[PDB]
Amino acid sequence: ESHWCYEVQAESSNYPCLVPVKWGGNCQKDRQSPINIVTTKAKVDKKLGRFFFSGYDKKQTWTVQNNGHSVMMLLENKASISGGGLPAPYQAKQLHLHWSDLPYKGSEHSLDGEHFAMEMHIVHEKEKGTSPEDEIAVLAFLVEAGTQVNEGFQPLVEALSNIPKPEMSTTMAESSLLDLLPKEEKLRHYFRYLGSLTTPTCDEKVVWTVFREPIQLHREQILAFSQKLYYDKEQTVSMKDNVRPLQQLGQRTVIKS
Ligand SMILES: NS(=O)(=O)c1cnc(Sc2ccccc2)c(C(=O)NCCc2ccccc2)c1
Ligand SMILES: [Zn+2]
């Protein structure tokens, strides 16, 4: 029985694995993610207010792990968001990233056809009792190189050395989620659409937010993900290009704040 993989991993080894075109679950349905967002066709909707964050400010030591597909930090319901047009508070479950080693191919979403060097996803789950297509709220930040070191990221980057192989975990030095995000001014403009998880089983229960302004990291910070992390316990295939191909918008529309 073969298991799901990204294209780069079928291309780089003898392992039979299900490339994205052949993924099971809900991955072949029609409200899938990621997508290309034509920014001029996204209409402003004033229901889309500022996000409020909470526990994002608190400095913590987080578990971060290599699950064979990405690096994931486990957020354990220690933070939450509301506003942003969302119907309730959503509790933060995990944060992971998608990336390449070249500047124009590591993001999952694209804006007006441009792809970025990485994309970070902070996955949250709707809190119950306020009342399915918006059970999961994913905050997606696009990442490109900049001249400066993004210091907030350094404890994530440094922990990568301790989790080179799939199934390894480690603990990051004290760090807050806010250290990963840009200033609140950069959080004003975002795009919104309803879609899916981007790995199997690709359940169509996500309310997506893609912030318009990319985060910046130093090029060596971005490169560390592909230089330190592997898709295989033999460490023969560097983890990069863990990116699902673009899906069809279909009937859906994208709106923006
Ligand atoms: N790429 S994505 O769509 O943002 C996403 C969202 N939620 C989840 S797991 C999850 C789902 C619902 C509630 C809590 C966690 C996952 C997810 O866990 N996918 C399987 C392992 C993985 C993780 C990250 C990258 C590659 C592979 C992915
Ligand atoms: Zn993701």
The arrangement of helices and strands along the chain is EHEEEEEEEEEEEHEEEEHE
Rounded to an integer in angstroms, the radius of gyration calculated over CA atoms is 17 Å
According to CATH, the homologous superfamily is Alpha carbonic anhydrase
CATH fold group: Carbonic Anhydrase II
Q: In what range is the share of β-strand residues?
A: 25-35%
Which ligands accompany this protein?
ligand AG5, zinc ion
CATH class: Alpha Beta
PDB class: lyase
Keywords: Structure-based drug design. Small molecule complex. CO-CRYSTAL., Glycoprotein, GPI-anchor, Lipoprotein, Lyase
Assembly: monomeric
Entry title: Crystal Structure of soluble domain of CA4 in complex with small molecule.
List keywords for this structure.
mainly beta; Carbonic Anhydrase II; 13-stranded mixed sheet; two-stranded parallel sheet; binds ligand AG5; binds zinc ion; metal-binding
What's the short version?
With 257 residues, the protein is mainly β. 9% of the residues lie in helices and 30% in strands. A lipid is attached at residue 257 (GPI-anchor amidated serine).
Explain the overall architecture:
- The chain has 257 residues and is mainly beta.
- It has helices at 7-11, 154-160, 219-228; strands at residues 3-4, 17-18, 36-37, 43-44, 51-54, 63-66, 71-74, 80-83, 90-99, 110-111, 118-126, 136-146, 169-171, 190-195, 206-211, 215-218, 255-256.
- The chain has a single domain (1-257), classed as Alpha carbonic anhydrase (Carbonic Anhydrase II), CATH 3.10.200.
- A hairpin with a 6-residue loop joins strand 8 and strand 9 (90-99).
- The chain is globular and about 50 Å long.
- The N and C termini lie far apart (45 Å).
- The structure holds the ligand NS(=O)(=O)c1cnc(Sc2ccccc2)c(C(=O)NCCc2ccccc2)c1 and zinc ion.
- A lipid is attached at residue 257 (GPI-anchor amidated serine).
